[PDB]
Every structure is written in structure tokens, then in C-alpha cells.
Amino acid sequence: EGREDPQLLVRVRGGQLRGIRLKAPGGPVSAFLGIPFAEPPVGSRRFMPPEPKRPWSGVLDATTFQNVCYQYVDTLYPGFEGTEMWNPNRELSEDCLYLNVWTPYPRPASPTPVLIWIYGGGFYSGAASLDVYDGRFLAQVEGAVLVSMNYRVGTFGFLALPGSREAPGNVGLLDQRLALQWVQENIAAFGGDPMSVTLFGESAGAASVGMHILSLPSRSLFHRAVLQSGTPNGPWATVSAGEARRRATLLARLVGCNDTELIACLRTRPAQDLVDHEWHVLPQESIFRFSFVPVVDGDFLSDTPEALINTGDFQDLQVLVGVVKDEGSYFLVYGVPGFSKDNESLISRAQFLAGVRIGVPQASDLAAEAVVLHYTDWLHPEDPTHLRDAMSAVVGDHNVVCPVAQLAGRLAAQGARVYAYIFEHRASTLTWPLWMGVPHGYEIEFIFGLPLDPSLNYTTEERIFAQRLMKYWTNFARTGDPNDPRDSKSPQWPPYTTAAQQYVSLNLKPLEVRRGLRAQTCAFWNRFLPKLLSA
Amino acid sequence: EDPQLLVRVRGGQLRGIRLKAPGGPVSAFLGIPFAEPPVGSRRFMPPEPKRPWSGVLDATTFQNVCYQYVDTLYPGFEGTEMWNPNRELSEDCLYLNVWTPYPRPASPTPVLIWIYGGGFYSGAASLDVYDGRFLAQVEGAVLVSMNYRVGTFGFLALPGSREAPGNVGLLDQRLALQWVQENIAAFGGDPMSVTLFGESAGAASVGMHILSLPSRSLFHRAVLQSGTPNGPWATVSAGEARRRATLLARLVGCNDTELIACLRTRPAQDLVDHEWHVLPQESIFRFSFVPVVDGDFLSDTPEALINTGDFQDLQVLVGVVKDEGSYFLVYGVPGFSKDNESLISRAQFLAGVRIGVPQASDLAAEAVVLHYTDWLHPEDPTHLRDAMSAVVGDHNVVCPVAQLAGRLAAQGARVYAYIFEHRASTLTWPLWMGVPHGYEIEFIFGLPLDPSLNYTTEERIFAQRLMKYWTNFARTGDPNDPRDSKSPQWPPYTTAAQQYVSLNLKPLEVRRGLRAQTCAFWNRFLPKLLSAT
Numbered sequence A: 001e002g003r004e005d006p007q008l009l010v011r012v013r014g015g016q017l018r019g020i021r022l023k024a025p026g027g028p029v030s031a032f033l034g035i036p037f038a039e040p041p042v043g044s045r046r047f048m049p050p051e052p053k054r055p056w057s058g059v060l061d062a063t064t065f066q067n068v069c070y071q072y073v074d075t076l077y078p079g080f081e082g083t084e085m086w087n088p089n090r091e092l093s094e095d096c097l098y099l100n101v102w103t104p105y106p107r108p109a110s111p112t113p114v115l116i117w118i119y120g121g122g123f124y125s126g127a128a129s130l131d132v133y134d135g136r137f138l139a140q141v142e143g144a145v146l147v148s149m150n151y152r153v154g155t156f157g158f159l160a161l162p163g164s165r166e167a168p169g170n171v172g173l174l175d176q177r178l179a180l181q182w183v184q185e186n187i188a189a190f191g192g193d194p195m196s197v198t199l200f201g202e203s204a205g206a207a208s209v210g211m212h213i214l215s216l217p218s219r220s221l222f223h224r225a226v227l228q229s230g231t232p233n234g235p236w237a238t239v240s241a242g243e244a245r246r247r248a249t250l251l252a253r254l255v256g257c258n259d260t261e262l263i264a265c266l267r268t269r270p271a272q273d274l275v276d277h278e279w280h281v282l283p284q285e286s287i288f289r290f291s292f293v294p295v296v297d298g299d300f301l302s303d304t305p306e307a308l309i310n311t312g313d314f315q316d317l318q319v320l321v322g323v324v325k326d327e328g329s330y331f332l333v334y335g336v337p338g339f340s341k342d343n344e345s346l347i348s349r350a351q352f353l354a355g356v357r358i359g360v361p362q363a364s365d366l367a368a369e370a371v372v373l374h375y376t377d378w379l380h381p382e383d384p385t386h387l388r389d390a391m392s393a394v395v396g397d398h399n400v401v402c403p404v405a406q407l408a409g410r411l412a413a414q415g416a417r418v419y420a421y422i423f424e425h426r427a428s429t430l431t432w433p434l435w436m437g438v439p440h441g442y443e444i445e446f447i448f449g450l451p452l453d454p455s456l457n458y459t460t461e462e463r464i465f466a467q468r469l470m471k472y473w474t475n476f477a478r479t480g481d482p483n484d485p486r487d488s489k490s491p492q493w494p495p496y497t498t499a500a501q502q503y504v505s506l507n508l509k510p511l512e513v514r515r516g517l518r519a520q521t522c523a524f525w526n527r528f529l530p531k532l533l534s535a
Numbered sequence B: 001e002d003p004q005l006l007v008r009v010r011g012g013q014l015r016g017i018r019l020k021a022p023g024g025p026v027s028a029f030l031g032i033p034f035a036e037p038p039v040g041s042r043r044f045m046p047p048e049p050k051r052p053w054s055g056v057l058d059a060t061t062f063q064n065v066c067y068q069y070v071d072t073l074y075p076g077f078e079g080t081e082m083w084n085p086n087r088e089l090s091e092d093c094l095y096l097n098v099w100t101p102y103p104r105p106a107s108p109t110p111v112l113i114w115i116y117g118g119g120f121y122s123g124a125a126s127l128d129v130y131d132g133r134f135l136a137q138v139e140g141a142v143l144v145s146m147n148y149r150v151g152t153f154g155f156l157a158l159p160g161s162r163e164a165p166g167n168v169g170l171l172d173q174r175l176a177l178q179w180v181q182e183n184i185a186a187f188g189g190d191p192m193s194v195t196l197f198g199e200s201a202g203a204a205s206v207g208m209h210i211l212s213l214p215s216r217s218l219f220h221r222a223v224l225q226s227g228t229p230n231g232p233w234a235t236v237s238a239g240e241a242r243r244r245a246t247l248l249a250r251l252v253g254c255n256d257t258e259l260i261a262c263l264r265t266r267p268a269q270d271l272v273d274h275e276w277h278v279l280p281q282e283s284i285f286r287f288s289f290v291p292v293v294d295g296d297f298l299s300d301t302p303e304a305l306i307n308t309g310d311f312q313d314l315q316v317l318v319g320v321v322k323d324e325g326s327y328f329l330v331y332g333v334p335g336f337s338k339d340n341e342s343l344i345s346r347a348q349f350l351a352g353v354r355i356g357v358p359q360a361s362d363l364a365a366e367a368v369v370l371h372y373t374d375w376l377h378p379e380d381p382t383h384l385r386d387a388m389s390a391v392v393g394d395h396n397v398v399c400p401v402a403q404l405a406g407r408l409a410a411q412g413a414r415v416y417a418y419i420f421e422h423r424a425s426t427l428t429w430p431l432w433m434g435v436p437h438g439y440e441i442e443f444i445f446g447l448p449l450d451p452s453l454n455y456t457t458e459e460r461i462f463a464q465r466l467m468k469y470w471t472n473f474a475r476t477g478d479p480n481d482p483r484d485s486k487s488p489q490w491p492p493y494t495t496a497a498q499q500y501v502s503l504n505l506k507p508l509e510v511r512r513g514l515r516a517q518t519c520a521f522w523n524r525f526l527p528k529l530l531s532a533t
């Protein structure tokens, strides 16, 4: 050193880092990108828990995003922004256990609340380095310290032979945990406050956040939580030990491969081979089902999430949870026949009954009859616009909206402070057709405040709206309360409670308060439908 | 010695009485016998035609009420008493009444035939609310009502036996309908335009004449008020009828022939004493002796018969009241009384549902609870009390009606449907019960036109409307008033549009779908649940 920017040299437990000064709309930020937090999980370490990163010599260059974890790359719609935005934007490699830090410039003198992002991607994709997770705006505008990590997805992060030493499963969850530990020990170097760490994540990121809520060793590593459109409970976020064993051994068969012999053989397989067969192991044709997800191992997850939400003590917990207007529309184009991004997708009753078997793949004939009976509009039972929307509702409700209600309910009753939202604003830029409304993931760019970049084409009300949301989020991280402590003018977001079940609408209009989160419909999914699966 | 009051029917001569209605005189022929008294060896037997009589039979007074249970739940309360027998009980009860305009119509007049309800265990054609003087006078209708056997006497069956074949109460009705084909012309009725109407078990009876071929030649149109032949309460299987019959026998100290002989030796009231101890479960809106699927009167189940029948040349008017379920809650659901407001608890609601849906398995019971609970206020007692009412009304009346209306329309019938929402000002039941079943009858019959009865002046205008709808329906097959416009028309009920009208003080409002979501539950899902316990 000697001739370079003094604000950009930091020491962490493993060594020296050089960050980069970055432009935000309203001024500069500090970014430290691609800080390794684990030994590269390669070679004999594939399928295994992360090991802490051994110290390095010299000044590690932390000025660019690092590798993205090895994963499936979607190609359904080439050139199409709506899908491309989620695709890896750095080299795919198994050597991907890196994390990123954004802080103000200059770094703050007093310790600042830390927000840690956990990306979604169904546990088979994702990357901390996508544009919509750019931490600079929350860093520049709200003075937050934002941290995001890569964690292993797909087989690499989730293939499990439960009980074995060499593939215990949940290791992707462990990468996340290791990055949380890294934050505890090192964030202060950046002016972060380790005693004020808030996890936020969306979809599998949200289910991830909830796993950490439910898993004791993770508990001491954060104080507050945000789950956007995802839950640790529900039909897709976990598999049983048996089922995980089953998918793992099938995948092994499909590629050539006593648990030791099998795993050892899997370890000799090229990464692309596992990705090529990843999708062939699901018990039924489905949507919103993923092959390698967190397992109920009786270790990380001591019991099913359903059990742990019911019987856990959430005394100390402030939690923000919510959903987008159309949780189910996105995946309809991936595998319900009838549906497409390129037309209105008006479907028939026949296509709807078939769609229900696909969106609720674990349902018997009777259970499905019940779904179809519930969501049919008996005045207009053949009406293709309603059917198309009912198909979206089934998928959205079953996988997200009702799980979120089950979670919000149990948490509030076990003594947690819960704030709930439904996000209803469709981006003016959005490239999915109108019929899809607000698909999951499309609140993210607002929360992170991307509309503040005047080069991005958002409307002026969208720029103001983004600021509102960044304020809710960072207020929540600061205090456990999304409300602005002075500003009593603006309508208050009340806690969600079992008695009143209040939540707010997030759109361009001021906060409006509503009651019951699809209460009638969720009684179907959460209370009735389980029992109809004891017959 | 008025010649207007003197008529020769096929069996001989009758002398009527001149009665007064608010706007003029009416000729009444009360207690005309249409069958041999069904007594002694005729108990449980089909009715035989009344033998001809000498001289002039006095038909100026209501005859006896068929032998039946009498309600004593709230002794001296007008709400219950208005349904109790207003004449002596007797097995000698097969009589009918005819009201006609005074003087007797110049040309053949459409006939309405009324069939009382009472759960097939009670009722009488002589109650004040079935008084036909108003329809006869104001609208010029020829109105006929008959007594039919009820309880064990009308409905006890040992199916297959010669001596108690079941459905005789219904055959009583059919014989009274035959009597009308043969005799109504003498009173200036048109036997070629006969319209049945009935309420509750009476509506079910109307529905069975629809589904029973030999009855079809005896009327041309039907009105079913708050009841249907299909659904949980109106029929029983042969197996189940045999079961209750043999159990009633055992209970009163008694091979088919031998068993019936013994039953015939018992005093009427001994049978009635044990009428209510034969039901398989604690229940409400369930009744021991009801029509039986006998392969004779009813060739198959009413469900089977409405799914496949051909109803091309049939006009039908069907409807329900706003609160079909409130009435029976006080008769055996803990927490319910007419005296307080019956704000019930959640536990009372779950136990109330096993009583309201007695044939429901544990899982089906739960589906119902989970459906009818308002999840925004799971434990509010007002909601829970109203949901209880709705479970019972929906399961027993509204959804069966929706089902019938759909089937009839799909299979060629011309159907009109209604919900009745006006609570009578004079009603003596508490407000929480709303509009209980049967409290439309007094309006259709035109009782508010009696200045002495203390109905509001709006209620009188309402009653006039209703009488016009019903009699227009009898005249033409269509309840709409030709002379009259814009304001608005009553559209036929169809499977596509599902249009019905609200009947209340405001002008007709057209609505679509009759508890459409909730009836999909009862009519489509619930059978599947139970079938797979």
C-alpha cells in the first residue's frame, strides 16, 4: 500500500482486503466483493460441510464478484430479460464460497445495523452477484452495511445420504451459517454492528432464513428476520430423510454410481453431469418442486419445520413476512400445458384439472377433487379467464400464501413480533405478460432500491415507492419495527396478530390495512387438506 | 237455500257454506270425503275411493285432522301453536276442501291444489295459514286442499308386504288429485289446468308426484316451497324403512302379516308415543316415517329419477326462505332457545354439526365446520350461531333445491326460482331466527289482506304481488304479469345463468347463483367424502 485509497483497505480474521469505491446515485459506497469465507468445497470436499477459509497472505483483491456456484442455467426464453435477469452472471464453478460487503463511504464511525441477504432460486440456482441484489443503494441511501453470500445449490449443496459422514445434506444451509459466523467475527472491521444483524431473503432465500430461525446454532448469529415469499414449512422447502436418500441414490444410478462407495463415485463425476440429471429424480411431474432441498436430518433441522414452528419459543423474535400479488403465475409457463408468456393463456376446464395434478403433485384423486371444487367458480365453471387465474391461485396459495399464513400465525402465537405485507405493484419495466401480475421476485428490485438509478427507466412514483420500501426494511432492521418512529402522519403498519390478522398493502398508494390473509382459502390448505391425507 | 252452495259431485250432493273475504263472498266446500276412512284393517293400507252417499252431505266445516304427534315444546306460544291441529285428531281424516269464487266461475278456472308440510309427521289442511278464501276471491282461483295420513299411519312400511307397502300418505294425496280430475269441473275448476303447490314436506310430496308416473296425468305444473324429493330427509331406503317399522313394532310389544295385524290392534296414540324413538342417530331435520324408495311409487331414488327423467312439458316454481335452518335449532341443538339470543360457543357449534349432519363421518363433520367457520372471527358467537342455522338450512333445503332446479332445467323443464326475505311484522319468534321456513305461506295465501290481522299496509301490497305471481304461474306456467313492464321481469332459472329473484318489499331483484360455492360443497364434494367414509 501507500499510494491508494485509505478507505478501501480492511483487515479481517483471514487477512487483508482491498475494496472498491463505487458510484451510487447520491454518492460513493465501499464494496468488498468476493471475500472467501470457506475453503473451496471442491474435490473430496464436494457434498461436505464448509470448512472455514484458511488465512491468506498479502492483500486479497476484493473488487469484483466471484464465481457463481455450479447450477442449472435456464434457456426457456433466450434473449428474454424476464428469465435472463436470474441467470448466473459470473463463471460457474464449484469454487464459489465467497461473500460481498457494501458499506457507506467513508465507513461509519459508530457501529451500523447489518442486513444479510440470502438469495432465492429454488435451492438449485441463484447468486449474490445479480444486479437486483446490488447493495450499493441501501448502503448509500440508508447507511446500511449489507452482506450477501454464495451458498451451494442443487446437488452440490443439497444431495444427502442422511446418516452418512460424507454427504450429510443441508450443507448449503451450512455455507450460509458459515457466512453468518464470518459476519459475527469480522463485520465490525467494516463498521458493522454484529449485535444488530437482520437476515432477509426471498423464496428459497426466505425458506433459508426460516431454517436459521428454527436451528439453534444459527440463532445466536442474528436478531431479526425478513422472509419474502417463502417459508421453511410448506410443501417444497424440505424433504424427509427417506425421500432425500431416494433421490440421491437415483441420481447416483443415473450417472454411473454402502454410502461411502456411492459418494466417492459421485465425487469423481464432473459437475455438469450432476446438473444434467438433477431434474430426473422427482417422484411426479410437478411445478414448484425441486430435487435437492434442505433435509429433515434431525441435526440442522431437529424435526420437521411444521413441528418446530408449532412447539418453539419465539419470545425474542421480530419478523417481517409477506407475499407478492401473484405467487403462482411464474411457474405455470414452465410446465402446465396451456400456459405461455407469449399469449393470454386462457385454459379449459380440462387443462385446469390437469394443471391441478401438476401444481399439487402430492394429492390423491380426492384431495385434487377438493382443490378443484374449492377454486372453481360455480357461476362460470368453464370460463377460461377464471380458470387461468384459479390455476395461478392454486399454485401460489399452496406453495407460498398459505405457508406464509401458517408461519405468521404460529410465530405470533408463540410470542414473536410479526409484520406482514402483500406486495401489489407491478414494475413499469416488467417483461412478463400482464396476466402474470406481480410474479415472485419482482418486489426485490424495489426493496434494494434499484429505481433510484436514473439510468433505469422506472417512473417517478416508482423511485419514491422504492425509498418507502427501503425505509420500511432498514427501519425494521434497526428497531424490529418498520414504522418511522417520528413520522406519525403516515398510516401505521400494525403487527400481525392471531386475533386481528392485520397486514399491509405495498403499492404506489399509501399503506392500507387489511385483515385475514386468504383466511378462508388457507383454512382449506392448512387445516383441512392435511386430514384428507389421512384417508 | 242458496243454489250456489249446492253441488253434485260423482259421489252425491254437497252443501257448502258462504264465507266472507274482505272484498266479497266466497263459496267453500269443507271436509268433503275422498276416501273410505283408513281405519281398522285399512290402517297402513292404500286409500280406497269413498262410496257414494245418500242425500245432501254437509260440507260446511273442516273435518278431523289426521292422527299425529302434537308439539308441546313451547305450550301456548303462537309461533308453535299455529302449526298444531285446530280440529280433533282421528284416523278418519281422508277429507278435502274446495274454495271457489262466489258466484261459481262462468268459465273453467285454473285450479291450485295445496299440500301441507309438517315433516310427514304432522300438518292439516285446516290451519288458518292455508285458508283459501283470499286466493279464491281476489284472484278467482279454485283452491283445493286435502288431508293425507302422516307419521306411522301414512308412512310406516314393511316394503314388499301386502299389508303395509309404504307411501300410503302419498297415495292419499294422489287419490285427492284423481278426485279433482273427476269433480272439480262441477265447482267450475278446470281439470285441465291443475297446479300443485306445497311447502316443506308438502314440497317434497309435490316433487314425488313429479317423479311418479301415475301422478303426472293429474296436474300440469308444480310449485315446491322450501322442500324437494331429493336430499337427506325426504326418503328412506326399503332396508331402513323395514328397520324402523320392525323397531316400532318391538317397542309397542309386537313375519310381515303377523306383525302388521298386531300393529293394527294398537290405539293410535300408542304408535305416536314411540314414533320418535326409531331414528338411527340424535338429529334434527330427520323424521321417522317418510316416503320410502319402494320400486313402486318411486321406481328408483329421487336422485336417480331427477338425473334421468324427461321434464320437457313441465313448468316448476321452486324457492327457499332466507333462513331455512333457524327453526329446528331450538328443537335439540344445545345452546339454542327462542327466549335468549343463542350466542353459542365454538364447542357447541362442533357438537351442533354432528346433530345437524347426523349421517356425517368424523372427517365430513370437519369439512363442514372448516367450511362454515368464518376464519377472521373463528370464535365470535353471532357468526357461530348464524353458521349453525346455515349448515342445517343449506344441507336440508337450499342445496337440495339448487340441485333439483339445475336438474329439472337441464332436462327440459321451465323453472323459476326465488328466495323469500321478508320477515313478517307479526312474527313471534326472535329476530335471530330471521325468516324461518313456513313464514312465507301466510303471504302467498293472502292473509295480510285481512284488515283485522294487523299486518302493515306494505305487507298487504306484498301479499297481493305474491298472490299474483303464484296464480299467474298457475294460469300460464309463467309467474310474470303480462299487463306490466320494465320493473323487472322474472327470468327462468337455467344451469348456465342460475338466475333467481328476491321476494321482499323492494321490487324484484335478479340474482345469480344459489349458494353456488357452498352448494358445490354439499352436492359435489360431500357425497365423495362420505363414500370412502
Ligand SMILES: *[P@](=O)(OCC)N(C)C
Pocket (backbone or CB within 6 Å): A120, A121, A122, A123, A202, A203, A204, A205, A440
Ligand atoms: P424461489 O426460490 O424462487 C426462485 C425459483 N422459489 C420459487 C422456491
Ligand SMILES: *[P@](=O)(OCC)N(C)C
Pocket (backbone or CB within 6 Å): B117, B118, B119, B120, B199, B200, B201, B202, B437
Ligand atoms: P317441513 O315439513 O316443516 C316441518 C314443521 N319440514 C322442515 C320437513
